[PDB]
Amino acid sequence: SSRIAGDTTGKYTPNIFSPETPMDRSFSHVPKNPFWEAWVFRRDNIQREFVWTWQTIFDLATFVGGLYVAMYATASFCSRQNDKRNGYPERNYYFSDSKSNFVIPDEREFY
Amino acid sequence: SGHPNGSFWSEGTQVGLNGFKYGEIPLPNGQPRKKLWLENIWNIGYGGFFLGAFCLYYGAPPGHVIPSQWATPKAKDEYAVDMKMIDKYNERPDLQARLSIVLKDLNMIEEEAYDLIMMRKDYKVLLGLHSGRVPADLKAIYEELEA
Amino acid sequence: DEPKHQIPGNALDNWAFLRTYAKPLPDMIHYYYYVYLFGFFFVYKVADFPEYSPRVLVMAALIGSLFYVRRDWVHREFKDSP
Amino acid sequence: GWEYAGTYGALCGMVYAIGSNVISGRAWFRRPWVHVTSVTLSYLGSKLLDEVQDTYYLEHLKRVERKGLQVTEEHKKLFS
Amino acid sequence: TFNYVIPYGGSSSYTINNEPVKAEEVTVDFSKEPSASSLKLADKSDWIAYTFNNVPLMATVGLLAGAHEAFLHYERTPIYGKRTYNIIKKLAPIVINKTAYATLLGAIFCATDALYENYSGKKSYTSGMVAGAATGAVFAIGRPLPQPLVWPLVFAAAPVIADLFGEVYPESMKSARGYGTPYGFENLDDAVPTRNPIRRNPHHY
Amino acid sequence: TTATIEERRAFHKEVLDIVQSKLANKNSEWARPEEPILHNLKSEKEEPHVYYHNNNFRVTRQLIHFEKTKIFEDELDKCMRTHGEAKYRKCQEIAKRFQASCRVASNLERGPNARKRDVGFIYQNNKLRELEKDAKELGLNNPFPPSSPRTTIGY
Amino acid sequence: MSLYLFMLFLQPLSLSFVSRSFSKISSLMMSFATLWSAVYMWFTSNGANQTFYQVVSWGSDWSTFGVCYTSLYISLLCAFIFPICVILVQGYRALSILICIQTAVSLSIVSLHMLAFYALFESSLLLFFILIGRRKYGSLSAAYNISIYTFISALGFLISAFWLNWSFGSVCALLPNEEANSFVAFGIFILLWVKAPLVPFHLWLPEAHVYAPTAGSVLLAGVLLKISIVGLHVFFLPICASSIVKAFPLILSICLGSFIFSSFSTLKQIDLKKIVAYSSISHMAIVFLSSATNSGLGIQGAVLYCIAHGLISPGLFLLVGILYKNTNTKLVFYLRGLSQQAPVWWSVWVFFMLGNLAFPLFPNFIAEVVCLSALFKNHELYAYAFIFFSFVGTVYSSTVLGRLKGGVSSQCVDASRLDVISWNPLVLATVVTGIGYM
Amino acid sequence: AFVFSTLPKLSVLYLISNSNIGSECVWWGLISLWLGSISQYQSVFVRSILLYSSVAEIGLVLLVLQEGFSWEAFSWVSIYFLSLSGVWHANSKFVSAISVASIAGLPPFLGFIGKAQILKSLVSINLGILIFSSILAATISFIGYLRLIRLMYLVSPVKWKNNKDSSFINWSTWMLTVGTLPMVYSV
Numbered sequence A: 001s002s003r004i005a006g007d008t009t010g011k012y013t014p015n016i017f018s019p020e021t022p023m024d025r026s027f028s029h030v031p032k033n034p035f036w037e038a039w040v041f042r043r044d045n046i047q048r049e050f051v052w053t054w055q056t057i058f059d060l061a062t063f064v065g066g067l068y069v070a071m072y073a074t075a076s077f078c079s080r081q082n083d084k085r086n087g088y089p090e091r092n093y094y095f096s097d098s099k100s101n102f103v104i105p106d107e108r109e110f111y
Numbered sequence B: 001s002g003h004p005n006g007s008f009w010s011e012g013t014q015v016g017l018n019g020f021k022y023g024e025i026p027l028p029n030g031q032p033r034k035k036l037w038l039e040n041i042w043n044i045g046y047g048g049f050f051l052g053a054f055c056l057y058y059g060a061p062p063g064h065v066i067p068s069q070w071a072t073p074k075a076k077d078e079y080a081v082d083m084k085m086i087d088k089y090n091e092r093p094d095l096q097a098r099l100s101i102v103l104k105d106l107n108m109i110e111e112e113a114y115d116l117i118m119m120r121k122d123y124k125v126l127l128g129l130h131s132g133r134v135p136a137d138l139k140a141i142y143e144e145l146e147a
Numbered sequence C: 001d002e003p004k005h006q007i008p009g010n011a012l013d014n015w016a017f018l019r020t021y022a023k024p025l026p027d028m029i030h031y032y033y034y035v036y037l038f039g040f041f042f043v044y045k046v047a048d049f050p051e052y053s054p055r056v057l058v059m060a061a062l063i064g065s066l067f068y069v070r071r072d073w074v075h076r077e078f079k080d081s082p
Numbered sequence D: 001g002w003e004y005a006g007t008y009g010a011l012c013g014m015v016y017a018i019g020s021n022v023i024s025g026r027a028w029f030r031r032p033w034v035h036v037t038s039v040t041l042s043y044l045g046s047k048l049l050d051e052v053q054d055t056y057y058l059e060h061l062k063r064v065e066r067k068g069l070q071v072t073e074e075h076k077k078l079f080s
Numbered sequence E: 001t002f003n004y005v006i007p008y009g010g011s012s013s014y015t016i017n018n019e020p021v022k023a024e025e026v027t028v029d030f031s032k033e034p035s036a037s038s039l040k041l042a043d044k045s046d047w048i049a050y051t052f053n054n055v056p057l058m059a060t061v062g063l064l065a066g067a068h069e070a071f072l073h074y075e076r077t078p079i080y081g082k083r084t085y086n087i088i089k090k091l092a093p094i095v096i097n098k099t100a101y102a103t104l105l106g107a108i109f110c111a112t113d114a115l116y117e118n119y120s121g122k123k124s125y126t127s128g129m130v131a132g133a134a135t136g137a138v139f140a141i142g143r144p145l146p147q148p149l150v151w152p153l154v155f156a157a158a159p160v161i162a163d164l165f166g167e168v169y170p171e172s173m174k175s176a177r178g179y180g181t182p183y184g185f186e187n188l189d190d191a192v193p194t195r196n197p198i199r200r201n202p203h204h205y
Numbered sequence F: 001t002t003a004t005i006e007e008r009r010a011f012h013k014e015v016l017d018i019v020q021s022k023l024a025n026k027n028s029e030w031a032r033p034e035e036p037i038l039h040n041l042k043s044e045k046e047e048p049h050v051y052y053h054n055n056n057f058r059v060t061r062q063l064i065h066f067e068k069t070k071i072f073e074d075e076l077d078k079c080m081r082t083h084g085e086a087k088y089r090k091c092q093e094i095a096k097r098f099q100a101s102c103r104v105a106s107n108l109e110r111g112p113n114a115r116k117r118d119v120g121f122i123y124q125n126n127k128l129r130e131l132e133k134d135a136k137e138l139g140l141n142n143p144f145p146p147s148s149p150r151t152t153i154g155y
Numbered sequence G: 001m002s003l004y005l006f007m008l009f010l011q012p013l014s015l016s017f018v019s020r021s022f023s024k025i026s027s028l029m030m031s032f033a034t035l036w037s038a039v040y041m042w043f044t045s046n047g048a049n050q051t052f053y054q055v056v057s058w059g060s061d062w063s064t065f066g067v068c069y070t071s072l073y074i075s076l077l078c079a080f081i082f083p084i085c086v087i088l089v090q091g092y093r094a095l096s097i098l099i100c101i102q103t104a105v106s107l108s109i110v111s112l113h114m115l116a117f118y119a120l121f122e123s124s125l126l127l128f129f130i131l132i133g134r135r136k137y138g139s140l141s142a143a144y145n146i147s148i149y150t151f152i153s154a155l156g157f158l159i160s161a162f163w164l165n166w167s168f169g170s171v172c173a174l175l176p177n178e179e180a181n182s183f184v185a186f187g188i189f190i191l192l193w194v195k196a197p198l199v200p201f202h203l204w205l206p207e208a209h210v211y212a213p214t215a216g217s218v219l220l221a222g223v224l225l226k227i228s229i230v231g232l233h234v235f236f237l238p239i240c241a242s243s244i245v246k247a248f249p250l251i252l253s254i255c256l257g258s259f260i261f262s263s264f265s266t267l268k269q270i271d272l273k274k275i276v277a278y279s280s281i282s283h284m285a286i287v288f289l290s291s292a293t294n295s296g297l298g299i300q301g302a303v304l305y306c307i308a309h310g311l312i313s314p315g316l317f318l319l320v321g322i323l324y325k326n327t328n329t330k331l332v333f334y335l336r337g338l339s340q341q342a343p344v345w346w347s348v349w350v351f352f353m354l355g356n357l358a359f360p361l362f363p364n365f366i367a368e369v370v371c372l373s374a375l376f377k378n379h380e381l382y383a384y385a386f387i388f389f390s391f392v393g394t395v396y397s398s399t400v401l402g403r404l405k406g407g408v409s410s411q412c413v414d415a416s417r418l419d420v421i422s423w424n425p426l427v428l429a430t431v432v433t434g435i436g437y438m
Numbered sequence H: 001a002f003v004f005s006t007l008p009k010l011s012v013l014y015l016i017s018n019s020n021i022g023s024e025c026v027w028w029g030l031i032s033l034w035l036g037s038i039s040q041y042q043s044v045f046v047r048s049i050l051l052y053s054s055v056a057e058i059g060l061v062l063l064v065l066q067e068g069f070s071w072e073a074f075s076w077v078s079i080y081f082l083s084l085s086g087v088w089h090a091n092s093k094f095v096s097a098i099s100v101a102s103i104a105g106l107p108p109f110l111g112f113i114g115k116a117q118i119l120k121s122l123v124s125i126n127l128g129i130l131i132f133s134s135i136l137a138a139t140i141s142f143i144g145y146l147r148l149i150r151l152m153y154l155v156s157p158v159k160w161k162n163n164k165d166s167s168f169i170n171w172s173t174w175m176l177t178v179g180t181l182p183m184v185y186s187v
C-alpha cells in the first residue's frame, strides 16, 4: 500500500500511475481536526466580534493610554534630572513651553 | 539485566544503524550516495566567506580592520607622559592652586584635576584655549609639567 | 468544507434590501448640467468672497463632507410620497 | 554633460531588443538585426539628448547672467 | 559623522552669532500682504462679531449640501405623472434643515473659539481643540456609543491640522530661499544674485 | 561674539588654502589627524573641510583614550593582585588615575542626551560638600549624608 | 565597492540570458560571487579612512555610493543570507522577483543620496505585492497592508528630501547640512517609524511574514527591517539630531510602548511564524532607542544587535518553514512530540530560541549588553524599564517550547540533508559572533 | 480617449504659463485632488479609475502651474503621455503593469520623475495643506492602481485580444524604463 519515492542513486521517478501510495513528503502531514480549524479561523478573525462598549473603552484607555502617559511622565522626569545633573539650561523640548532655546549642548563649551 | 555478557568490557550488542541520518537508506552494495547539486557550490562559497573573514581579521595590518589596534602604541606613549605629569602635580602644591583657579573657570570640580591633565591634547581644550574659553594659564601649567 | 465568515441576516431579507436599489435610474446629465452652470457662476462669485481663516475653512470642509449625501443613498431611500 | 551617456545608450538599446523579444514570446537572441539597430540608434539618441541638455544649460546661464546673477568664472566652468 | 565613536550631527555655539546678510541686493516681492478684510474676519475680540463674520461660510456649505440632496430628490420625481403632494413642501425642509444645522455647528465652533481665546488671553492650539470638541459634542447628542467619542475627536483634530499646516508650516519655512546661497550657509561660494527671481506676478483674480 | 560675512568668507578662503596644502603630499594617515583645525565658527558644519578633519581628530583622540583606559585598568588589576590585604592603601593612587581616565573617555563625547559619567562618585561627593557647607553656615538641617573621605577604591 | 556594485547589477542581468533550466544553479553561483565581492569590499575598506571607507560616484549625485560602518555590516549581512533564500525558492518567476528585490535592497544600503535611496528601496513595492499575494499560499490583505504602509511612509520621506534639496541645494549625505524644522524631521522620521515596526505602525509586518514564502520571510526579517537603521545613521541623525533630542521623551514613550505591547501581543499567538514575527517587533525597539541616544555606544550597539537579529531570526524562520514543509501545519497545538520525532531539528530550534532569548553564548547577549549600557548612559530608569519587561519574552518562548516538546505523535517529521545544508552557515555564524567575533 | 486626455492639456498649460492666467485660489486643485482620489478608489469599472486619476493629477498640476513652474508641467505632460500610452492601448499585461506603475509615480520608471517634478515644485511654494492633502490623496489613488495590478495577475486567468499593432507601445515602455536615469538632473 506504500512505496519509497526517494532514490539516493539519483534514478528518482514519480510514479503517478503506481497502485501503491508513494512515501513522499505528504506522508508525514498532520491529519488535522475540524473544530481546531474553526478555532483558528475564529481567533484570527476576532475583529468581527469587536464591539465598542464602555468596558472596552475603559480597558483600552486604562492600560494602553495609561502606560503611554506613565512612560512619558517618567521620561520627562529623567530628562529634567539629567539637565540638572549635566548643568545644562532647561532644554526646549517639544511640548514643554520654555523661554530658552537650548537644545543641543555645544561640545566646545564647558558646562 | 546487568551487562550483556556479565562483563562491562564486552562487545556491543547492537549491530547495524542506530538510526537513519537525514532519513537516507544505506545502499545495498555499498554504492556511495549521489551528491546533491548544491553541495559543492555551497561548500566552496561559504567556506570561502569564512576563510576570507579569518584571513582578513588576522592577516591585515593593525588599524586596517580593527582601528583600536592602531591606537595601542600611541596610548602607551601618552600613558607614560600622563604618569610623569600627574606625579609632578602631586609633588608641587603651587601648581595645584593654579589649576584650582583654572578648574573653577571651566565649571569643573577640584577632583577633576587629573582629568584636565589627561585632556591636554583634545578638541575641547585645544580649541577653547584658542577661542578664549580656557584661561591661558592652563598652557603654562601644562608646560611646567613637561607639556 | 472550510471555516467561513458568518453572514448576518437572512438570505431573502438581505436580497430584498438589495432589490431596493433596482429603481428607475435618471440620467446623470440633469445633475451635471446644473452643477456645471452653478459651478461656473460659483467660481465667478468666489473671487469676491472675503478671506477666511484657515481654521474656519477646514471646519467648513469637514461640515460639508459630513453633510454630503452619496447619490446611491438617495437612490435606495427615495419615496415618491409627501 | 553626463560622461557615461553613450555606454548607457548602448546598454539601453540592448534593453530594447531583449525586451521586445520577450514581450512577443520570442527568446532574447531572436531577430538579431534588431539588436544592432537598437544599440546604434539608442547610443546616438543618448548622446544627442546630452548635447541638448548642455545647450539649454548654457542658454540658462547666459540668461541669468543678463538678469544679474553674478556667476564667477568657475561657475561659468560648471556649465560647459 | 558616519562613525561609531563620536555622536552624529554637530553643535552650534550659542554665544557666537552670525550677522544677517541679505539674500539679494534688491528685494522684489510678488507676495501680497493680508487684506484689511482678512484682518477684520480674523479679529476675535468681540465674539458675536467674530461669529457673525465667519458664519456665512458655514451657511453656504449647508445650502450646497441641502441643494445637492434636494436635487437628488427632485430628479427622481416623475414629471409625466401628476403628483398629489407639493414638491417644494417636500424639498424645502431638506435645504432649510441642512443649512440651519450647519450654521449652528459653525456658530458653536466660532463662538467657543473666540470665548476661549479671550478668557485665556493667548493664541493657542487649545482654543481650536476645545471649540472643535464642543462642536463634535453637539454633533453627537443622541447618537450611538462610538460617536460620542469619535466626533469630539475629529472636530477637535480639524483645527489642529488647520493650525499646524496653515500657520506654523508657513512661518517655519519663511527664510529658506532655494536660490543663491543656503540660508544658514552664506560663507559657501555660490552665485550671489543682484535680484531675487520673480517666477510670477502678484495675483489679481 | 559676532561674525561678519567678510570674516566668514576670509576663513573659507584660508581653509581652501589648508586643503590645497594637504593635497600636495600624499598621507596614509590623512584621516587620523594629530592636530585640529582651529576655528571660531558658530557651527563647524559651515566649513565642510574643517568639519570632517576635526571629526577625524576627535575619533583618533577617543580611540587613544579607550586604549589608555585599558592600560590603566591593567596596572590597577596588577597592583591589586600584588599587595594583597594592603590593596586599599597602596592601590589608591592607581585607582584614582584609572577612574580619571574613564571619566575623560566617557565624558568628552557622551552626546546630546547622555549624562556625565560619575566614576568614583566625585560629583555627588562635591554636591554633598556644598550642601553641608550651606546647611552649617545657614543653620539648616541637611537631610543628606555628609561628604565621605573615600567612597570608592580611589576617588 | 565597484566590484560589489557590478556584481549586484550582474545578478538580475544573468537571468535574462540563462537557459531557464540552469536558472537555479546560475543564481546560486551569482549569489556566492556577490558574497565574495562583498568580502573584497571589506578587504579594500581601510579603517584608516575613518569617515567613509569607500566612496564611488558614477557621474551624478544620485550615483554616489559609499560604505560606512553600518552600511558595511548590513551589506555583508544581506550578501551572507541571500544564497539561503536562493536555494529555498523554485521557479523562474520566483527567482526573478527575489533577485530584483535583493538587487534593489542591496543598492539602497550603499546609496548616499536620499532620493536615490528612496528610488531603489521603493522599486521593490509591487514585487512584494505580487510575492505576498501569490495565487494559492498568499493573502491579498497582507500585500495591501505592506504596500500601502510603505507607500505613505516613503512619500513622506520623499517630501522631506525634496524640501532639503530645495533649501540646501543638495540631498547627498556627504555634504554637511543641518535643519531644525520639525516638519522635515517628522517626514524623515515617519519612514523609520513604519519600516522599523514600531507601535502602532507595526501591523503590516506580521501579515506579510505569515503569508510570504520562507525565502521572502528570511529576506524581510534579515535585512529589510535593518534598512531603517541605515536610514537613521545615514539620513536622519546627521541632519535631524536637534529634533531627536527635542522629542526624546516622546521617542522613549513610543519605543518602550512598542516593546511592551509587542511582547504582550506575542503571548496571544498560535502560529509559529507570527510568534517569530512579533519577537522581531519587540527586538526593533531597543535598536531604535539606542541609536536615538546619539552616542558612540548606541550606534555601535544598534548595528551589532541588528547583526545579531539578522543571524537569529532568519534561522527561526527557516526552521519553521522546514517544519511546515514536513507537516503542512504551523499551529503550535497540532505540533507535539517534536523532541522525540525530530531530535536534529529540535536541537537547532532550541539553540536559536535560546539565541532569541539573548543567552550569553549568543551574539544577542553582547549586542543587548552594549545597547543597555547606552540606555544606562542616558538614564538608569531607561535601562531598568527594558530589562524588566524582557521577562515577557521568556514566558511566550517557554510556553511555545513546552507545547512543542512533548506529547504523542505518530509522524516522523525531521529535516533532510538539504535542510541541514541550509542552516549550517547560520549556526556557524551565530557561534562565531557569539564568542566575540562580532 | 488616450489622445484627447493628454494632447489638449499641453496647449492649455502653455496658454496659462505665457498669458499669466493664474489665480490665488487653491480650492479647485485641492478639490480635484481629493475628489479624484476618492472616486478612483470607489469606482468599480477600470475606465473610470484611469479617468479619475487624470482629474487628481491635473488638479495638482494646476496648483503647480499657477505659481509659475512651467518647465515642470511641460515635462509632466510628456511623461504622462508616455505612461498612459501602455495602459490605454492594452495588448500585453506586462506593458500595462509597467504603465500603471509609471502613472502611480513609482520609482524605477520615468513616471517617478514626472510626479517628482510636481511634488518638488510643491515644497518650494511652502503651502502645508496642499502637501498634506497630496500625501493622503496619493495613498488613496495608489490603492486603485494596486486594484489594477491585482485584476491582471492576482484575480482570475486573463485573456485579451491579440491586437498586434503596438506602433509606439514598445518604444513607450522602453522609454519609461530607460529614461529615468538620463532625466534625473531635472529632479
Ligand SMILES: CCCCCCCCCCCCCCCCCC(=O)OC[C@H](COP(=O)([O-])OCC(O)COP(=O)([O-])OC[C@@H](COC(=O)CCCCCCCCCCCCCCCCC)OC(=O)CCCCCCCCCCCCCCCCC)OC(=O)CCCCCCCCCCCCCCCCC
Binding pocket: C034, C035, C038, C039, C042, C057, C058, C060, C061, C062, C064, C065, C066, C068, C069, C070, C071, C072, E061, E064, E065, E067, E068, E071, E150, E154, H027, H030, H031, H034, H035, H038, H039, H042, H129
Ligand atoms: C442643484 C444642483 C445640485 C448641486 C448643488 C451644488 C451645485 C454646485 C455649486 C458649486 C460647485 C462647486 C463646489 C462644490 C464642491 C466641489 C465638488 C464638485 O463640484 O464636483 C462635482 C460633483 C459631481 O462630480 P462626480 O464625478 O459626478 O461625483 C464624484 C463622486 O464619486 C460622487 O459619487 P458619490 O456621491 O456616490 O460618492 C461621494 C464620495 C466622493 O468623495 C468626495 O466627495 C471627495 C470630497 C473630499 C473633500 C473634497 C476636497 C475638500 C477641499 C475643500 C476646499 C475648500 C476648503 C479649503 C481648506 C479645506 C482643507 C481640506 O464621497 C463619499 O463617499 C461620502 C463622503 C463625502 C466626503 C468624504 C470625506 C469624509 C471626511 C470626513 C471624515 C469624518 C469621518 C470620521 C469618522 C469615520 C469613521 C471611520 O458635484 C458635486 O458633488 C457638487 C455637490 C455640492 C455639495 C457639496 C457640499 C459641500 C461643498 C463644500 C465642502 C467641500 C467638501 C466636499 C464635500 C463633497 C463634495 C463632492
Ligand SMILES: CCCCCCCCCCCCCCCCCC(=O)OC[C@H](COP(=O)([O-])OCC(O)COP(=O)([O-])OC[C@@H](COC(=O)CCCCCCCCCCCCCCCCC)OC(=O)CCCCCCCCCCCCCCCCC)OC(=O)CCCCCCCCCCCCCCCCC
Binding pocket: D008, D009, D010, D012, D013, D016, D031, D032, D033, D034, D035, D036, D037, D038, D040, D041, D042, D043, D044, D045, D046, D049, H171, H178, H179, H182
Ligand atoms: C538611452 C537613454 C535615452 C535617451 C534618448 C533615447 C533615444 C530614443 C530613440 C532611440 C530609439 C532606439 C529604440 C528603437 C530601435 C529601433 C527599432 C529596431 O531595432 O528596428 C526595428 C526593426 C524591426 O524589425 P522586425 O522585428 O523584423 O519587423 C519588421 C518586419 O520584418 C516588417 O517587414 P518589412 O516589409 O517592413 O521590411 C522592411 C524592413 C524590415 O525587414 C527586416 O527587418 C528583416 C531583416 C533585415 C535584413 C537583415 C539585416 C541584415 C544585417 C543585419 C545584421 C545583423 C547581424 C547579426 C548576425 C551577424 C551576421 C554576420 O527592411 C529593412 O531592414 C530596411 C532596412 C534596410 C537594411 C536591410 C539590410 C541591408 C543589408 C545590410 C547592410 C549592411 C551589411 C553589413 C554587414 C551585414 C552583416 C553583419 O528592425 C529593422 O527594421 C532592421 C532595419 C535595419 C536592419 C539592420 C541593418 C544594420 C546594418 C548591418 C550592421 C552593420 C553595422 C551597423 C552600423 C552601420 C550601419 C550601416
Ligand SMILES: CCCCCCCCCCCCCCCCCC(=O)OC[C@H](COP(=O)([O-])OCC(O)COP(=O)([O-])OC[C@@H](COC(=O)CCCCCCCCCCCCCCCCC)OC(=O)CCCCCCCCCCCCCCCCC)OC(=O)CCCCCCCCCCCCCCCCC
Binding pocket: D008, D010, D011, D012, D014, D015, D016, D018, D019, D020, D022, D023, D024, G012, G013, G015, G016, G092, G093, G096, G097, G100, G101, G103, G104, G119, G120, G123, G124, G125, G126, G127, G130, H093, H094, H097, H098, H101, H107, H108, H153, H170, H171, H173, H174, H177, H178
Ligand atoms: C552590450 C552587450 C550585452 C551585455 C548585456 C548588457 C545589457 C544591459 C541590460 C540588458 C538586459 C535586457 C533587459 C531585460 C529586458 C526584459 C526584462 C523583462 O522582461 O522582465 C522580466 C524578464 C523575465 O520575465 P519572463 O519570464 O521572460 O516573461 C516576461 C513576459 O513578457 C511577461 O510575463 P508575465 O505576463 O507572466 O508577467 C509576470 C510578472 C509579474 O507582474 C509584475 O510583477 C509586473 C510589475 C511591474 C514591473 C515591476 C516593478 C518593479 C521592477 C523593479 C525593477 C527591477 C530592478 C530593481 C533595481 C532597482 C532599479 C531602480 O513577472 C515578471 O515579469 C518578472 C518580475 C520581475 C521582473 C521585473 C523587472 C522588469 C522591469 C522592466 C523590464 C524592462 C522592459 C523594457 C521593455 C523593452 C521594450 C518592450 O527578465 C528577467 O529575467 C528579470 C528582470 C531583469 C531586470 C532587468 C531589466 C532592467 C530594469 C531595471 C531598470 C533600470 C533602468 C534600465 C537600465 C538597464 C541597463 C541599461
Ligand SMILES: CCCCCCCCCCCCCCCCCC(=O)O[C@@H](COC(=O)CCCCCCCCCCCCCCC)COP(=O)(O)OCC[N+](C)(C)C
Binding pocket: G435, G436, G437
Ligand atoms: C555539532 C557540533 C559538534 C562539534 C562541537 C564543537 C565543540 C566546540 C568546543 C567548544 C570551544 C570552547 C572554547 C571557548 C574559548 C573560545 C575560543 C576563542 O575565542 O579563541 C580565542 C583564544 O582564546 C582561547 O584559546 C581560549 C582557550 C580555550 C581553552 C581554555 C580552557 C577550556 C575551558 C573552556 C572555558 C571557556 C570559557 C570562556 C567563556 C567565554 C581567540 O583569541 P584572540 O586572538 O584574542 O581573539 C580575539 C578575541 N575575540 C574572540 C573576542 C575577538
Ligand SMILES: CCCCCCCCCCCCCCCCCC(=O)O[C@@H](COC(=O)CCCCCCCCCCCCCCC)COP(=O)(O)OCC[N+](C)(C)C
Binding pocket: D045, D048, D049, H164, H165, H166, H167, H168, H171
Ligand atoms: C532625445 C529622445 C528622447 C525624447 C523622446 C521624444 C523624442 C522622440 C524621438 C524618438 C521617437 C521614436 C518614435 C518611435 C515610434 C515607433 C515607430 C512606429 O510607430 O512605427 C509604426 C508606424 O505605423 C504606421 O502607422 C506607419 C505610418 C507612418 C510611418 C512613419 C512615418 C514617417 C514620417 C517621417 C518622419 C520623419 C521625421 C520628419 C522630420 C523630423 C509601425 O508599427 P505598426 O506596424 O503600426 O504596429 C507594430 C506591430 N508590432 C510592433 C506588434 C509588430
Ligand SMILES: CCCCCCCCCCCCCCCCCCCC(=O)O[C@H](COC(=O)CCCCCCCCCCCCCC)COP(=O)(O)OCCN
Binding pocket: A061, A062, A065, A066, A067, A069, A070, A071, A073, A074, A075, A076, A077, G381, G385
Ligand atoms: C484616554 C487615554 C488616557 C486615559 C487614562 C490615563 C490614566 C493614566 C494616568 C496615570 C498614569 C500614571 C501616572 C503618570 C502621570 C502622573 C501625572 C503626570 C504629571 C507628572 O508628570 O507628575 C510626575 C509623575 O511621576 C512620574 O514621573 C511617573 C510615575 C508613574 C510611572 C511609574 C508607574 C507605572 C510603572 C510602570 C512602568 C511605566 C514606566 C516605565 C518607564 C511627578 O511629578 P514631577 O516631579 O516629575 O514634576 C513634573 C511636573 N508635573
Ligand SMILES: CCCCCCCCCCCCCCCCCCCC(=O)O[C@H](COC(=O)CCCCCCCCCCCCCC)COP(=O)(O)OCCN
Binding pocket: A095, E120, E122, E124, E125, E126, E127, E153, E154, E156, E157, E160, E164
Ligand atoms: C497628523 C497630526 C494629527 C494629530 C493626530 C493625533 C491623534 C488624533 C486624535 C484626535 C485628537 C485631537 C488632536 C490632538 C492632537 C494634539 C496633541 C495634544 C497635545 C496637546 O494637547 O498640547 C497642545 C499642543 O499640541 C498640538 O496641538 C500640536 C501637536 C501636533 C499633533 C501631533 C503631531 C504629530 C502626531 C503624528 C502622529 C502620527 C501620525 C498619525 C496620525 C497644546 O499646546 P498649546 O500651544 O495650546 O499650549 C497650551 C496653552 N494654552
Ligand SMILES: CCCCCCCCCCCCCCCCCCCC(=O)O[C@H](COC(=O)CCCCCCCCCCCCCC)COP(=O)(O)OCCN
Binding pocket: A093, A094, A095, A096, A097, E164, E168, G156, G159, G160, G163, G181, G182, G183, G184, G185, G186, G187, G188, G189, G243, G244, G247, G250, G251, G254, H123, H131
Ligand atoms: C502627540 C504626540 C506626538 C506624536 C509624535 C511621537 C514622537 C515623534 C517624534 C519624531 C521626532 C522628530 C519629529 C519632529 C517633531 C514631530 C512631532 C513632535 C511633537 C509635536 O507635534 O510638536 C509640535 C511641533 O512640531 C510640529 O509643528 C510639526 C509636527 C509634525 C507634523 C505632522 C505631519 C508632518 C508631515 C510633513 C511631511 C514632510 C514635510 C516636509 C516639508 C508642537 O509642539 P510645540 O513646539 O508647538 O509646543 C506647543 C505645546 N504647548
